[PDB]
Design a protein around this ligand. Sequence first.
Ligand code: HEM
Ligand code: HEM
Ligand code: HEM
Ligand code: HEM
Lengths: 146, 146, 142, 142
Amino acid sequence: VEWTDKERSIISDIFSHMDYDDIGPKALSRCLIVYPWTQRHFSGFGNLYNAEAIIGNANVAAHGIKVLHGLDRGVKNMDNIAATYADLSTLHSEKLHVDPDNFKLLSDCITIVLAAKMGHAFTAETQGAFQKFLAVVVSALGKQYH
Amino acid sequence: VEWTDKERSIISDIFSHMDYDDIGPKALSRCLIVYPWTQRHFSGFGNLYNAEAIIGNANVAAHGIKVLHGLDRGVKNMDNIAATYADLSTLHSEKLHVDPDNFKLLSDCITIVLAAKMGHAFTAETQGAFQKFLAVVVSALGKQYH
Amino acid sequence: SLSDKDKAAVRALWSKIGKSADAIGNDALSRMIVVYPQTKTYFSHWPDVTPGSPHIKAHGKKVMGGIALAVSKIDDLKTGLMELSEQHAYKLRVDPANFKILNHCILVVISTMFPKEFTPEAHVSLDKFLSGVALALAERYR
Amino acid sequence: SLSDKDKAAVRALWSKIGKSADAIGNDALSRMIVVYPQTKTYFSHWPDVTPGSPHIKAHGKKVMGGIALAVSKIDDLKTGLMELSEQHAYKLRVDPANFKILNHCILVVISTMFPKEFTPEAHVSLDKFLSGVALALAERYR
Ligand code: HEM
Ligand code: HEM
Ligand code: HEM
Ligand code: HEM
């Protein structure tokens, strides 16, 4: 994939200020609420039946940070994300079994969250370059679903 | 993208037997009809409110031949698709203002009409290669869009 | 939303091919995980999640009849399918985005079976209904 | 279908946020066209396709007023926005998949300006909303 330089500052920037322990729990917890089918795997995490019992699940807290950091490498491996995410994908596919449509649904939960944290700072601009990075990881994230 | 031989052969097979004169017209006819919003750029080809209007219109039949035959080029340029369609992409974008999602709609209808053409020879594996193609090519028609 | 035309249109075709409703599903269920072998995630507990096998084929029936039930209760797929909605939403929590894929392979398989009945006219109607069947399934998801 | 609770949630939210709809509308199209340039196809009539252009803000207003009317008609979304379906489908011939796009957008804009209002709870029941909104609008297409 291609990559402007301004796609690179904004994206680079976006991991400078990004609150990892703030938005991390705020986006997986947000995933399992707007798209509760995503709780399909996390079934052992404890109570998740109703909304704030999900915002009240520490495991999702934890993991949501996991997830967040999991896009770290990609920022490093921008021109090699697929080769870089190849084994993540394969993991989620054969061991985990996660339906790859959900990957794309968490992204929009990650996006959105960042959106209220950056407020007037998450411009069209930044949304463009931000999405145009998660939409590559996800890809790679799916690339080994055979 | 990267093709296997079976996928090579399969697109060899299918496209060699194509009665462009039937399929061609039809696959545009059924798409006009099952996806009326794609009649945005066919309007002045006559009236189109009715089944008979479309299927029985030559500015679409003879137009559905274009499209199909436009597929020709990709079967021969089997690894240069994106490169190849960038003039088809630029045209449809900056010359006719078409909605790229409409590519897959039409692609889609190219599979239903063909699958009704081929029947059982058209297994899942057969489907697989043909929708891989059109997918490949379709991504190539959505490149010049900015 | 399905108009009247549609109901007829649909219904009036179910008529024709309802006898092949069994075989149609094992074939649509097969084309689902062939071209889209990532929907195999839910099925992963089936040793033979492969084209037209014991599980895949046997299931084919209890999905096409599922399309039977729908076609009957077309005037109210939400009431008619509500029990399925529990099934796919509170049990095998199936991402709704996958129902489109399935429909897709159900159109293709019916074309390849009834290339004369499945007209464009029965295409838009069947299509609408299929989407219809999807939304109901997604009744109680969230 | 919007739960009674979804209804109550869409109404709260647009109580706190209907204040600034044109601002929202504007930043929303602005984002659609810049982040989904495959949508400039419908705005081609203009020269003016600048993010935040004047022509692009009146329409923002134009776009949320229909929202505002959607909340007002949240018992029947089909019936209520019938007119708006007529324009998009046959005048404008707007591909319906562009509904899901301005929707993530309005939800992103909605997220920028009102972080305290946009709980996940508010977020979910408003997705359920505009999606039916999107579907209410596909009614006169076919
Ligand atoms: C942005 C995309 C995603 C990222 C970066 C990500 C990140 C991660 C990472 C790094 C792990 C740890 C696995 C290991 O090393 O053993 C993990 C596990 C897991 N992921 Fe994802 N994930 C993503 C998408 C998803 C989605 C969307 C879902 C649910 C629909 C999901 C479900 C799971 C589950 C159930 C686990 C198991 C926990 C564990 O074994 O530690 N993943 N994820
Ligand atoms: C499979 C995807 C498609 C392919 C391969 C394709 C290919 C072609 C070709 C080869 C031409 C001939 C150029 C000419 O006649 O001047 C053409 C023209 C055209 N196509 Fe496409 N097309 C595709 C999809 C579409 C779609 C989805 C639409 C609109 C719904 C569309 C609308 C047009 C129009 C309006 C013209 C111009 C005809 C003229 O200038 O007289 N095409 N296309
Ligand atoms: C046309 C759309 C669909 C219909 C009408 C439908 C209907 C049904 C029915 C009636 C059953 C009952 C099984 C039983 O009696 O044991 C079932 C089970 C099942 N459904 Fe579907 N379904 C649809 C789409 C999907 C999709 C798209 C998926 C995932 C890709 C899916 C996943 C499953 C699974 C995994 C089971 C379990 C069956 C077993 O374990 O034998 N369904 N569905
Ligand atoms: C999100 C839901 C939407 C709502 C509530 C909505 C509402 C409206 C309204 C109220 C109008 C005013 C018609 C007039 O008198 O000019 C309009 C016009 C229009 N809409 Fe939509 N719209 C929506 C989505 C979209 C999308 C996603 C697109 C593009 C893909 C679109 C394309 C247009 C166009 C091109 C016009 C006419 C503008 C002009 O020609 O000046 N709409 N819409």
